[PDB]
Design a protein around this ligand. Structure first.
Ligand SMILES: Nc1ncnc2c1ncn2[C@@H]1O[C@H](COP(=O)(O)OP(=O)(O)CP(=O)(O)O)[C@@H](O)[C@H]1O
Ligand SMILES: Nc1ncnc2c1ncn2[C@@H]1O[C@H](COP(=O)(O)OP(=O)(O)CP(=O)(O)O)[C@@H](O)[C@H]1O
Ligand SMILES: [Mg+2]
Lengths: 283, 278
């Protein structure tokens, strides 16, 4: 009856709300209109989503994703209307707004995403009222998986972390220094590659130098992004796998910088379902 | 007459030496064999160097450049041989070895380059004996023009430096944030773009936040790169426009970190002239 989606770098999460039930665990590839053509997006829904659905008939669709800024929402709406039989309404907005709806519902707060990339905004309870452009894995995106990966690879290859952790990393991911350079400078989606090797931090978090890398990265995200908003007045909510799997260090960073922490959740899907059952039910 | 050259990402510096005199000072574009075919290098030499010479006869050529690793030495040497009339010797090596010969001559030393990129090595008096791979403008290249540019843009756009400096930057270079994202992530030579806007720091160095940016970047270069070497035994030499035009801050970084600076020079040409005169 209702279809909801949150689209990230790696995957899109789809949920169906129908007759008081939730059907989750429906995944496709990411669906970012800055990186995919309308025919690529259409091909992807047709081939990978529709087979997982009993029907393509829906009352409403609420699609959220990276790249679904104003300029791109008509494109995405178009793709969806061509694949799905939607009787009422198709909403398209950003992953950030999904994170806000999930974590804050209908009330105000500071909302942050910490996954492959990172992002932060002020949500007024209805819409994003302010935001800090992340700037990508090179210039910004502090605390993201990609930046964590960027920091780690720099530390290991420059021998900042000793021989053992370096060789353990290269052996684990079957990388040479030459391969890493190739992938970072000369292949598509280097941010994805870097994020993909960042779990090495969580696995080795016991090492003081690893713990420190993560702590400093997070402090950097908070001071450069979150502290731009009225943080002494509003809780900051965090959504994403980086936020979640390094939750202890994120709280440590917040205590050290002076930020009131709120929700820390792995993904916004549970919160979005709450949104569409409770608050958004009425409209 | 002998011809000496030091080639980086921006320029190739050439000197003609004859009878104890420097007979010409000539610039062409950079010639990196990883970024140019042998053909393209030949054309650039013929079109831009040769018109600036009054003969193409040299006893020796000594060409130093980024990318001129052993793998590429035959390719570069062949282009030079096909463009010039050299009687005795064509030597081809790295910009790093040029910095070493210039700053150290025949004595050991720690040698660093701080230009568009950065690099650090130990020179044993004859050849480079050890080095720290720079890792490029994303992963490494601490203290480089590219990285200074990267730090600046982040700081300005994320409002860490005030509104005035941000507006001044965007106005000066006729840039929007959209343009910047485009140039950094989706256009060729993003490191060159970043390095190309880095002079804004030198132009605004009296601003505390600007000075702070540069000091911290230099500290990071020293701790991550130079300190890998036997720096209490050898003084560290610095070659490059970034090392030169931020000399005072580099010395401050060095004193803060316990590194003993030697030579700080804009480029190795002076030193290379001394080298070939002994
Ligand atoms: N168990 C785990 N331990 C450590 N890191 C993990 C992890 N599971 C995932 N990650 C890391 O989290 C990052 C991606 O998390 P997430 O799935 O939230 O990103 P995403 O790309 O879908 C959101 P966006 O694109 O909006 O930033 C990657 O860096 C990944 O390696
Ligand atoms: N007067 C000046 N003040 C500050 N920065 C300067 C400068 N002149 C050049 N730069 C910057 O220095 C960087 C390059 O340094 P340099 O001039 O040594 O060239 P390079 O590193 O490409 C070696 P080569 O000269 O052989 O090409 C660029 O970011 C450039 O804009
Ligand atoms: Mg120059």
């Amino acid at each position: 009856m209702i279809l909801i989606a949150d689209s990230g770098s790696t995957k899109t999460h789809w949920n169906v709300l129908d007759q008081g039930r939730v059907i989750g665990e429906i995944f496709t590839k990411g669906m970012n209109p800055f990186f995919q053509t309308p025919e690529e997006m259409g091909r992807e829904i047709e081939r990978t989503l529709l087979p997982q659905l009993n029907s393509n008939r829906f009352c409403e669709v609420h699609f959220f994703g990276a790249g679904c800024i104003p300029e791109k929402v008509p494109v995405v709406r178009n793709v969806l209307k061509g694949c799905l039989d939607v009787s009422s309404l198709i909403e398209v907005d950003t992953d950030m707004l999904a994170a806000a709806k999930a974590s804050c519902g209908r009330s105000p707060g500071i909302v942050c995403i910490m996954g492959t990339g990172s992002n932060s905004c002020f949500y007024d309870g209805e819409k994003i009222a302010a935001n800090v452009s992340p700037l990508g894995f090179i210039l910004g995106d502090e605390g993201s998986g990609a930046v964590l990966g960027k920091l780690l690879i720099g530390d290991l290859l420059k021998n900042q972390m000793g021989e053992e952790l370096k060789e353990k990393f290269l052996r684990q991911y079957e990388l040479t220094p030459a391969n890493i350079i190739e992938r970072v400078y000369r292949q598509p989606f280097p941010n994805r590659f870097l994020a993909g090797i960042s779990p090495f931090l969580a696995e080795n978090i016991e090492h003081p130098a690893i713990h420190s890398l993560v702590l400093n990265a997070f402090k950097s995200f908070l001071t450069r992004n979150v502290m731009q908003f009225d943080y002494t007045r509003y809780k900051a909510h965090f959504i994403g796998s980086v936020a979640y799997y390094y939750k202890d260090i994120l709280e440590e960073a917040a205590a050290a910088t002076g930020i009131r922490t709120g929700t820390i959740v792995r993904n916004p899907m549970e919160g979005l379902r709450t949104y569409y059952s409770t608050v958004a039910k009425t409209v």
